[PDB]
């Protein structure tokens, strides 16, 4: 019973890596997004500044943010400006997450090679298309 | 009072064809501050001085848009009528507003 | 040199006509129903107090992940395993498929057994489809 | 004091079947002020010295009547329990009084 596959989530990958800038000037993300279940371990990230499940009392309201670490064997990507990659979205309890920062232990050992990801909850924002 | 036969004949030239939703009241200017795109609405034949929509109409409203008032148009871009829907609606994500029944009537 | 006593108490309640459809309210159970198929883990056991009268709340999520109205479906059937089969109520107003349990249903049930709740919906084109497969325990 | 098992066997013999409404308290005479007509009422099996009806009872109250009391009647046609209505209801016109729940019990 590997702990590396305890939790099971759904990842949205922008498979059709297009991500072009329209003639007007705005950003048009990939039109084709697929959602396939993966497996991994999601744990709170405890390191100094990083805040987990912390409500921030702004003079505009109360915003909530969190940062979890993700141990998994899947090769989730992150937004890259050279290969025109556009990150991966993890889901916990419905809320969308983003894979900022990556550690790549892919080849090192035999039965223990794994990726470590830092997933961050996406802030609430009004959505406009382009 | 006016005659129903007259009321039927007078209403046979309106023929609205497209419907457009506005966030603000278009009475002052029905040519401004549009939200959706012109979507076809087909009306019935004049009966008892009251025309009605034949089939339901689905208008795709973009995201972060509000619809509060509606307007009808004809082939030559001439706003025959304006009105207000039941209540304002805010579509956070891209949604659809369905028109269940439009009944232009003159029978007071 | 010894005498045991007792007492009586009678209570009543009326809601004089009003020509309505009563005000029936007794339940807390409302269930999910994804049409695409839902962490799998182990499904939880819905617990209805034996006796009483619960109102099963089934919410039709369309098959991307969105609530859908109770449309197309013209017949809904609750078919708790080897107990009974009764039609449900397609509620336009609350946009839910609901069914209330009565005293008659409990005459064919036993307190404690973990039955399976299977919900079938039939559209206009006569297509039976299983929506839910939750397990219920009447404790 | 009685036991639960003792009380359950007691209530297993009531079987009230008809209910009639009164304007003043019957107590002394259950044959007076028979405002309504006997209408069937169904009880349940005793449980911890308590019986409850299964469904509502629709009593056809005649017009110009003020109902304020209540008295059960069994198959033997001999009243076994009397009680108030908790509020005098005056049906100015012909109405439909409805009982939501009856409960006869001996838990003090």
From TrEMBL, chain A:
Protein name per the record: Uncharacterized protein
Q: Which organism is it from?
A: Shigella phage Sf14
From TrEMBL, chains B, D:
* Lineage of origin: Viruses, Duplodnaviria, Heunggongvirae, Uroviricota, Caudoviricetes
Origin: domain of life = Viruses
What is the name of this protein?
Uncharacterized protein
UniProtKB/TrEMBL annotation, chain C:
Instruction: Specify the protein name.
Output: Uncharacterized protein
Write down the species: Shigella phage Sf14
Taxonomy-wise, where does this protein's organism fall, top ranks first? Viruses, Duplodnaviria, Heunggongvirae, Uroviricota, Caudoviricetes
């Amino acid at each position: 019973m590997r702990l590396l596959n305890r939790h099971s989530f759904v990842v949205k990958r922008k498979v059709s890596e297009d991500g072009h800038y329209n003639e007007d000037g705005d950003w048009v993300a990939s039109q084709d997004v697929v959602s396939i279940n993966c497996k991994g371990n999601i744990q709170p990230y405890i390191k100094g500044s990083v805040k987990n499940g912390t409500q921030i009392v702004l003079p505009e309201g109360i915003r909530l943010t969190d940062t979890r670490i993700l141990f998994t064997v899947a090769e989730l990507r992150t937004s890259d400006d050279v290969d025109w990659t556009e990150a991966d979205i993890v889901m916990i309890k419905g809320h969308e997450y983003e894979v900022f920062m990556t550690m790549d232990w892919s080849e090192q050992l035999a039965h223990t090679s794994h990726y470590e990801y830092i997933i961050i909850r996406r802030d609430k924002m009004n959505a406009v298309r382009n | 009072t006016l005659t129903i036969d007259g009321k039927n004949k007078i209403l046979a030239t309106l023929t609205p064809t497209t419907i457009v939703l506005h966030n603000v009241d278009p009475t002052a200017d029905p040519t401004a501050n549009k939200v959706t795109q012109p979507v076809a609405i087909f009306f019935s034949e004049p009966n008892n001085g009251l025309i009605a929509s034949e089939d339901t109409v689905n208008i795709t409203v973009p995201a972060s848009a509000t619809v509060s008032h509606f307007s009808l148009w004809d082939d030559n871009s001439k706003c025959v009528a304006t009105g207000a829907l039941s209540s304002p609606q805010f579509f956070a994500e891209e949604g659809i507003y369905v028109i269940s029944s439009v009944s232009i009537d003159l029978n007071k | 040199e010894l005498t045991v006593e007792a007492g009586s108490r009678v209570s009543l309640s009326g809601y004089v006509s009003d020509g309505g459809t009563s005000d029936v309210f007794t339940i807390c159970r409302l269930l999910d129903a994804p049409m695409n198929g839902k962490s799998n883990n182990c499904n939880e056991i819905v617990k209805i107090p034996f006796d009483s009268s619960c109102l099963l709340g089934v919410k039709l999520y369309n098959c991307e992940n969105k609530r859908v109205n109770v449309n197309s479906v013209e017949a809904a059937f609750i078919t708790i395993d080897t107990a009974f089969q009764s039609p449900m109520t397609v509620n336009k107003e609350s946009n839910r498929l609901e069914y209330i349990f009565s005293q008659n249903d409990y005459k064919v049930l036993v307190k404690g057994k973990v039955y399976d709740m299977i919900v079938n919906v039939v559209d206009e084109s006569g297509n039976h489809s299983t929506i839910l497969k939750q397990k219920v325990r009447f404790n």
